[PDB]
Every structure is written in structure tokens, then in C-alpha cells.
């Protein structure tokens, strides 16, 4: 995540060559999508980037303080002084093909954070395992090797589909299921059995 409430998991990794590049031979370490800026209104993210770009070239810190008199204009002024197109943009080439991109890319430094919770600490899978003591159902938690809760919400979801058998199976064959002995007279579970 960037410093502006911009959460995102890595979708893919590309090695230097496949990545798009500047005619300086600069390449990104990261690629965020344009479709996460207009609705988010993280305008500061853009200013942050631009400012950090200036900062890296100038070799000075960025005054990202809030009630500053620092403007996009004043920054952009300096970035052009530093020989780059003032509004963050840069001409880039497609790494696969080598051809110039029809679009110029807003590219530069942006402080990004490595957050806790990683795929591998999250992945779980179960197919028969630790069954609960009283309830006789799969246990809770990935650590315990538990079964995932198929809530009422999910039962409802299946009733809507008209998936009668799957629902009975998902609640018997998988998870629970048991075989009791009932009286033809009183109709209760008080039937003693010598199964041999």
C-alpha cells in the first residue's frame, strides 16, 4: 500500500525485460492501475509521487507537510528545471516489442508499504480431518486444520439455485452425517443395537 489508503496484492511479477521502460533505461518496481485514482480521489498520491521524483533528482527531502504553501505548480516548475515533463509523465516503451507506448506514463518514486498478511500465511485447504469433540463437525481455524463454515447465507444461496442434493451432501456426506436407531412405536433414539 501507498501512503494514501491504496491497498493492493501483487497480481504478477515481471522480470526487467518484459517490464515497460523509459529511454533512460529506467523501469518500475511496481505498476498500479489508472482505474484506482478517479473514484478514490487520492490526489495527494499523485502530488507525493511528483514531489518524490523532484526530491530524488534534486537530492533533497520532500515537504509533504499538510498546511504548506507548496503547490503542484511550484513542484512541476522544478521537475521541468530537472529536464523531465513537468506533470510526472514520461515516454515509455513496451518491453516485449520494444515499440514506444502511444500513452506516456506518470512514473516516479512513491513510498510504498509492505503490510502483514501474505498469501501463504492465509492459504488453507481441508478434505476430512480434525473433527470437533461434542458437535462432531470439522474444527475452527487454518492452524487446527479446520473446515470452512457453510453459513445459513450459503445454505440460502443454494436453496435459490434449487441445488437440493448438493445441499444435503454438503451437510451430511461432507462435515456431519450419522446413523441412529429409532423405535417404530415411541419413535425415539432409545434403541439398543448389537451390530454383529
Amino acid at each position: 500500500a501507498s501512503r494514501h489508503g491504496q491497498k493492493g496484492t501483487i497480481g504478477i511479477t515481471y522480470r526487467r525485460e518484459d517490464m515497460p521502460f523509459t529511454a533512460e533505461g529506467i523501469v518500475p518496481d511496481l505498476i498500479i492501475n489508472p482505474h484506482a485514482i478517479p473514484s478514490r480521489m487520492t490526489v495527494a498520491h499523485l502530488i507525493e509521487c511528483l514531489l518524490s521524483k523532484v526530491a530524488a533528482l534534486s537530492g533533497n527531502e520532500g515537504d509533504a507537510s499538510p498546511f504548506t504553501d507548496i503547490t503542484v505548480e511550484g513542484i512541476s516548475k522544478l521537475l521541468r528545471e530537472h529536464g523531465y515533463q513537468s506533470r510526472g509523465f514520461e515516454v515509455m516503451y513496451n518491453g516485449h516489442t520494444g515499440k514506444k507506448l502511444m500513452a506516456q506514463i506518470f512514473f516516479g518514486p512513491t513510498y510504498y508499504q509492505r503490510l502483514r498478511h501474505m498469501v501463504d500465511d492465509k492459504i488453507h485447504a481441508r478434505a476430512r480431518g480434525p473433527m470437533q469433540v461434542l458437535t462432531r463437525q470439522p474444527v475452527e481455524g487454518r492452524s487446527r486444520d479446520g473446515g470452512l463454515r457453510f453459513g445459513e447465507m450459503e445454505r440460502d444461496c443454494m436453496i435459490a439455485h434449487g441445488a437440493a442434493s448438493f445441499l444435503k451432501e454438503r451437510l451430511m456426506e461432507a462435515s456431519d452425517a450419522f446413523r441412529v436407531h429409532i423405535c417404530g412405536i415411541c419413535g425415539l433414539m432409545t434403541v439398543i443395537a448389537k451390530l454383529n
Binding site: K7, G8, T9, G11, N33, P34, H35, A36, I37, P38, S39, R40, M41, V43, L46, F67, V72, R87, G88, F89, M92, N94, L101, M102, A103, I105, F106, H117, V119, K122, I123, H124, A125, R126, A127, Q137, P138, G147, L148, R149, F150, G151, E152, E154, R155, D156, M158, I159, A160, H161, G162, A163, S165, F166, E169, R170, L171, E173, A174, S175
Partner: protein, 783 residues
């Protein structure tokens, strides 16, 4: 509640989800480790014996391999430890718990499961890396973001459990939603953005590219279409190569605004056979739109056929855009110097207008209407002038934005972003509101201690003059923050509310299902409805169609439907009918032309009495327009030649077609009458559409083509009917529930306003569902 209604289950999966431009819509990327953990009991048949023997040999740690061989007499031979795992000579009847391999059916989900589409059968595609991979166009029904979402997976264990998944819950099956009778999935993000960029008239692609693009479409005839340009460079239009992803027999037509048959602005839509003629492809065409390319392909060509289309469109568009590229910078926020001066003066004049009304109020001259205070009327005026200000300044921004403005580019495609975003980011944030009213006096007679007492000015009561580009002042900041908090709070309120409303609705309608008599009955077998929806039609099979006998002047109505063969001017001439002259003054055929006209006028009234306001467009099964347009193209309709139908053909044809549009089957009184009613509305449409004059002068149909239109209408209608066993109760409960819960949780964005709803809203719907004796706004509207 938790051990019987809900349970924890085996054969379950779940992990972080990621997007896949190279996956099929109906597919799910299953990480190899997961594939290796989840099993499926496969009985040993001679059809499989060799594939299974090989799997057993591969073992638990090689992928296409299993764990456990269950023979007859219980006995679980465990492949990971067994001293015999090496050999194993399988016998028929024995089961093999093999790993979940490619193309298996699985039930994939995302919580909250407040929607039939939050649960969908997917085709497995075992993959490397640890995320569950999915096609971007399945994002919406699940309500997924790739910011960390988790998504669960469930494995069917029986052949009949697998059939249920693949024949009922399949992703392609679930394309057309029965909630909004419109389709739930469409082209989103990059693909939506790029499709627009590619469909530009200005967009021209060379051979090298063309060829790559063409090979990229997996169906592809293997035929290079002729370039639009054969002048000093063989150049292809964007529209052209994308039309390769569009299958033949696909007919689509629009007309947006300035759309003529020449659309100089390149708007609307025209797709004949399976090629775009004009109009830029964007959200209206390729989105979740009711009259979109998707609703059309799914209905006309099939669901599997349409699901395949998503893929193709993405494969070309994505590639083209991988090569075009698309960014967004701070640059796309900086609007003109001369434009800023206009925005600035727009705010200035609103601010002075406000000072004036205030000075007028302070002179005890401002006199409120009735029903409200001088103070009450004062605020809403000031509130109005200030919103009007932001909106005007916002449009000033929007208009000044170039065609190259990446934000304008996005809203233009409808890929992401709205007007308000432009407005806020670049021109003016706006007035902040808490509990409806603008920032109140937290401090004594002031909103902050940087202000004097009794200051009702825009800035003091939370009006943010500045844009996110310009920045906000501490006061503006704190006020924005105050209003911002409102959103976060009401999510944490309304979501716990809406969600309860959901379970209640769901429990209250669980057992309502269509029976084997079109009757909607519960567990007790009590009649709730005598026909589902009052028409015994399946919601998925319905779409908004215009009723032409309801609207227009009696003059225009006459011009359109009336045919007097006994009048030389007002009869149909022999240019549009073989029998034309042979029919002037028929008397016997004028008796049929007259009987037709009276039913057409009987409806005109009837419809004006049901749809009192005169609303033409109503959701009805069988899109007649498409059927007509289809026949025209299918039979390559020679608009210059007359025709081969008689008044007797068209009149008794439409007349008999209606006798055969079955919903109920009984030969008795009530049942035949129930059936007669069930169809009333559709028949108006049918008659309004298939009246004599309209068939000949307008559609210019042939006998061959007409006969087919009738058979197509009859068949389509029959398909459009509700299936007994449809769990309409749970369905309705979720169809009302899902929107509620998502009108919040969203919840937000932004801070201005977006209420009514939260506010109107979930408390009202709560009043209604609870049957609140003591309502909050009891109103009486007298006419």
C-alpha cells in the same frame, strides 16, 4: 443456528484472490497445493481404469495423482504411507480419491453470500503460485476487489452433486440475472477503457498488429478481413478487428442522442450480422446493460457461447491496450488558468448571493412560504446556492477537460470515475453535511474558536471552496473530516441493520416455491400467488419493451395502425403487397382489417387505464424487435420488392399465434381464464407490433420470414416461462436484500452527500418490514 442451519465442512478451500486476463469467465485458477489437497471419489470404470491407474502411480505429491484407494469392504489404502502404494492393481467398483484436476466442477464463493451469484460453479484450471485466479468479468456478482479479498471453494463429491453444479450454478448459466431481469456481468476496467480507445474512428491498426490481434481470438475463422483503408497503407479500423470477437447472426441497434443514420459524433450502436457499423463500444454496449451485446449474445447465441465472448473481447482489447498503454497523472487534475478564473468567480458570486439573502434575513424581510421557519427557509436557500456553485464550477472543469484527459477518458468509457470526482479533485470539493444540516455550532455560537460568534457564512458552516488539487485549509480539512466520519459511522450502523433485514426476509420466504401448477405456495401449501409475478414468467427471461398502442396522438395512432381499403388514400398501395390493387374496397377483408383496428383501439384504452401516466416501456418476455430485425437480416429482406402475405395471412396469423402462447394447460373455466389474463399485456405488445400496416409498410416482411417470426415468438415465450421448483421465495428475499446491504457497505464514496439512502432509507424499509404502528414521517398527500 450454527451446527444445523450452518456447519463447518470438509472438501473446502479458500485463499487470497487475484485477477486473470488469460482465464475463461467460467474458470477458476486453483493453486497446485490446493489441487493436491482436495480429492474426488471416482469409481473404477473401464472408461477411466488407465487414467486412474496412472494417477494412483503418480501418488499424493505429484500433481495428476491421488491419495487413498478405497476398495470394496471399506479399506482406505493410504497412498502416502502404504508399502503397496508402489504397485496397486485396481479392480472395478473400487474408488480412487484423485486430486482436483482441470475442468472439474467446483462451487466458488465470496462472503457476504447475500445473492444467488455469490455462489457459482467454476471449471478448474490447476495453476502455480498461491492465489485463486479469476476472470475479471466475474468480479461484480461476487463483489470482488483484488486488494486482499479471500473467496472460498467447495468440492462436489458425487456425480449427481457435480451435475447440480454444472447444470444449475454454472457461471455462464448465471450471466442473465433474475433480480434486475438484466445481465449481472460485463466488460470492466482496462477492457472497458481500452474497448472505447480501440473503437475510436481515429484508431487505425497495421498488418503486423492485426495479425497478432486476429491469432489472439481463439475461435477465429483464419481469414484476414479486408482493410477499411486500401490507400497508401493497408490500414484497419479498431472497430474492424474487434468485430472478429463478435459472432455472426448478432444484430444490435441503439441511437443515443445526436445519433442519425450517419452519427457524426460516432455515437449509438449498429452491429449487422456480426460486425460493428458505427458507434464507439463502451459501457452502454458491453456493460451489464439490459439491451447490451451480452443480453443479446446470451439470448440469441447461447450462454456458453456468450461466456466465450467475454474471453475473446478481453484477449484482443487487452493485447491492443498492452501495446497502446494508458496512464493517469497529476496533469489530469490541472484545469486551465482561464478556467480557474471562471470557477473562482462562480464561487465568488454564489458566496455574494448567500451574503445578500443573509443580509435580507437579518433585515427581517425574508418571508418563508408556509410550513417552515424563516430560519428553515434561509438554510435551504444558502445550501442550494452553495451546491449550485460546486456543480457549476464542476461542469466548468468537465467541459474545459481535453479529449486526452485520462480522467475524462475513463468516465467517457464509463470504466471508472464520475462528474463529482472531476468536480472535487479539480474545481471545488463542496459543502460538508452532518445529519443533513451543514456544520453546526459545537462551540457556543460558532463551529470553531477561530470564528466569531453567530457566523452563518458558507466557510464557517463547512463550505469547502477548495479542490483536492489546491488543497484544503485546516477548517475546511476538519469540516471535511467531520462529514467524512458520518459515512464510516453509518456503514457500521446500516450494515448491521440491512444484514438483519436480509436474514428476516430470507427466513420469511424460504419455502415459497412455484409448484407443478404455476401456483406460488408455501410449506403449508397455502396459495400466496396463483401465478408467479402475476404472469407465470421467469424473471431472467424478461426485458423492457415499448408498447406502441399506449402512447402518441390519436392522429399519429391512426397514421400508424388504420387501413381503410374502402378509402383510396388511406389504403395500403400495391408497391408493398402483391395483392394490393386486387384488394381495393374488399368489404370482407375490410371486415377483418376493421376487427383488427378495434382490438388495437380496445388495448390503447386498456393500457392507458392500467399504465395511467402513459409509460410505454415495460418489462415483457420475448424481445419482438430483435426477432423482427433477425428475420430481416436472416431472409436478406428486399425492401424494394412488394411481399407475398395477404391481409388474411397477417390478421389470422397474429390471431392464431396468440391462441398458442401457453402459460397454463387446463381445459376448464378458471384455468383457461387465468391463462387468458396471464397473457393480456404481452398480447397488447404482440398486436401493437404485428398489426397489418406495421408488418408491410414498416418491417416490409415476406410470408417465409413472417411464418418464422411466429414460430420464434412462440418458442421464445415458452422458454420465458417459470420452471416449477423455482425457489422464488429465497430469490425475492435476496433480490430485495442484496441492494439494501450494498446501498451501504459501499458506503460512501464520498463525503458530499450521498444521502438520501442511507437516510431515507434503511430506517423506512425497517418501519415497513416491521409494520411500525408509530411511523416517523406520517404524510397524507391530497389531490
Amino acid at each position: 443456528r450454527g451446527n444445523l442451519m450452518g456447519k463447518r465442512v470438509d472438501f473446502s478451500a479458500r485463499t487470497v484472490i487475484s485477477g486473470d486476463p488469460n482465464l475463461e469467465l467460467d474458470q477458476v485458477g486453483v493453486p497446485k497445493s490446493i489441487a493436491k489437497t482436495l480429492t474426488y471419489p471416482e469409481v473404477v470404470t473401464p472408461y477411466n481404469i488407465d487414467r486412474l491407474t496412472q494417477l494412483v502411480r503418480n501418488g499424493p505429491n505429484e500433481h495428476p495423482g491421488a491419495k487413498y484407494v478405497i476398495r470394496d469392504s471399506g479399506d482406505r489404502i493410504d497412498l502416502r504411507y502404504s508399502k503397496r502404494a508402489g504397485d496397486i492393481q485396481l479392480q472395478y467398483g473400487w474408488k480412487v480419491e484423485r486430486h482436483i484436476m482441470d475442468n472439474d466442477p467446483v462451487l466458488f464463493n465470496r462472503q457476504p453470500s447475500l445473492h444467488k451469484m455469490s455462489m457459482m460453479a467454476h471449471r478448474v484450471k490447476v495453476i502455480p503460485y498461491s492465489t485463486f485466479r479469476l476472470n475479471l468479468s466475474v468480479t461484480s456478482p461476487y463483489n470482488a476487489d483484488f486488494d486482499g479479498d479471500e473467496m472460498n471453494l467447495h468440492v462436489p463429491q458425487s456425480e449427481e452433486t457435480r451435475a447440480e453444479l454444472s447444470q444449475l450454478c454454472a457461471v455462464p448459466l448465471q450471466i442473465v440475472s433474475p433480480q434486475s431481469n438484466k445481465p449481472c456481468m460485463g466488460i470492466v476496467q482496462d477492457t472497458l477503457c481500452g474497448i472505447r480507445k480501440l473503437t475510436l474512428r481515429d484508431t487505425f491498426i497495421e498488418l503486423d498488429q492485426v495479425l497478432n490481434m486476429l491469432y489472439w481470438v481463439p475461435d477465429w475463422d483464419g481469414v484476414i478481413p479486408t482493410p477499411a483503408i486500401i490507400k497508401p497503407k493497408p490500414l484497419w479500423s479498431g472497430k474492424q478487428i474487434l468485430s472478429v470477437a463478435i459472432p455472426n447472426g448478432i444484430h444490435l441497434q441503439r441511437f443515443d442522442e445526436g445519433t442519425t443514420l450517419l452519427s457524426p459524433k460516432d455515437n449509438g450502436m449498429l452491429i449487422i450480422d456480426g460486425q460493428i457499423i458505427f458507434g464507439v463500444v463502451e459501457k452502454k454496449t458491453v456493460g451489464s446493460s439490459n439491451g447490451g451485446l451480452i443480453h443479446v449474445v446470451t439470448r440469441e447465441k447461447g450462454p456458453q457461447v456468450c461466456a466465450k465472448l467475454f474471453g475473446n473481447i478481453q484477449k484482443v482489447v487487452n493485447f491492443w491496450l498492452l501495446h497502446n498503454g494508458f496512464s493517469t497523472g497529476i496533469g489530469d487534475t490541472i484545469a486551465d488558468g482561464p478556467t480557474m478564473r471562471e470557477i473562482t468567480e462562480t464561487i465568488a458570486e454564489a458566496k455574494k448571493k448567500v451574503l445578500d439573502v443573509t443580509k435580507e434575513a437579518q433585515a427581517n424581510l425574508l418571508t418563508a412560504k408556509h410550513g417552515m421557519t424563516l430560519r428553515e427557509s434561509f438554510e435551504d436557500n444558502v445550501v442550494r446556492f452553495l451546491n449550485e456553485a460546486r456543480d457549476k464550477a464542476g461542469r466548468l472543469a468537465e467541459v474545459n477537460l481535453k479529449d486526452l484527459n485520462n480522467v475524462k477518458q475513463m468516465v467517457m468509457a464509463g470504466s471508472k470515475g464520475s462528474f463529482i470526482n472531476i468536480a472535487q479533485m479539480s474545481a471545488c470539493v463542496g459543502q460538508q453535511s452532518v445529519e443533513g444540516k451543514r456544520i453546526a455550532f459545537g462551540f457556543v455560537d460558532r463551529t470553531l474558536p477561530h470564528f466569531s460568534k453567530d457566523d452563518y457564512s458558507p466557510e464557517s458552516k463547512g463550505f469547502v471552496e477548495n479542490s483536492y488539487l489546491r488543497g484544503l485549509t485546516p477548517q475546511e480539512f476538519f469540516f471535511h473530516a467531520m462529514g467524512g466520519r458520518e459515512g464510516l459511522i453509518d456503514t457500521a450502523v446500516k450494515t448491521a441493520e440491512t444484514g438483519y433485514i436480509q436474514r428476516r426476509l430470507v427466513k420469511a420466504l424460504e419455502d415459497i416455491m412455484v409448484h407443478y401448477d404455476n401456483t406460488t405456495r408455501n410449506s403449508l401449501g397455502n396459495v400466496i400467488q396463483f401465478i408467479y409475478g402475476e404472469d407465470g414468467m421467469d424473471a431472467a427471461h424478461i426485458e423492457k419493451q415499448s408498447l406502441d398502442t399506449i402512447g402518441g396522438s390519436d392522429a399519429a395512432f391512426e397514421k400508424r395502425y388504420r387501413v381503410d381499403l374502402l378509402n383510396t388514400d388511406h389504403t395500403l398501395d400495391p408497391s408493398l403487397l402483391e395483392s394490393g390493387s386486387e384488394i381495393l374496397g374488399d368489404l370482407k377483408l375490410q371486415v377483418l382489417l376493421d376487427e383488427e383496428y378495434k382490438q388495437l383501439v380496445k388495448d390503447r384504452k386498456f393500457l392507458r387505464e392500467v399504465f395511467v401516466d402513459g409509460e410505454a416501456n415495460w418489462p415483457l418476455p420475448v424481445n419482438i424487435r430483435r426477432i423482427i430485425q433477425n428475420a430481416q437480416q436472416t431472409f436478406h429482406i428486399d425492401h424494394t420488392k412488394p411481399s407475398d402475405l395477404t391481409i388474411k395471412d397477417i390478421v389470422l396469423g397474429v390471431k392464431d399465434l396468440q391462441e398458442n402462447l401457453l402459460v397454463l394447460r387446463g381445459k376448464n373455466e378458471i384455468i383457461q381464464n387465468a391463462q387468458r389474463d396471464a397473457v393480456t399485456l404481452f398480447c397488447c405488445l404482440l398486436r401493437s407490433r404485428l398489426a397489418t400496416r406495421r408488418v408491410l409498410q414498416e418491417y416490409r416482411l415476406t410470408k417465409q420470414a413472417f411464418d418464422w417470426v411466429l414460430s420464434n415468438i412462440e418458442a421464445q415465450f415458452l422458454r420465458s416461462v417459470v420452471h416449477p421448483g423455482e425457489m422464488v421465495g429465497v430469490l425475492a428475499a435476496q433480490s430485495i436484500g442484496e441492494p439494501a446491504t450494498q446501498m451501504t457497505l459501499n458506503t460512501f464514496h464520498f463525503a458530499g452527500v450521498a444521502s438520501k439512502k442511507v437516510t431515507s432509507g434503511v430506517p423506512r424499509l425497517k418501519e415497513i418490514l416491521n409494520v411500525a404502528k408509530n411511523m416517523k414521517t406520517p404524510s397524507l398527500t391530497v389531490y
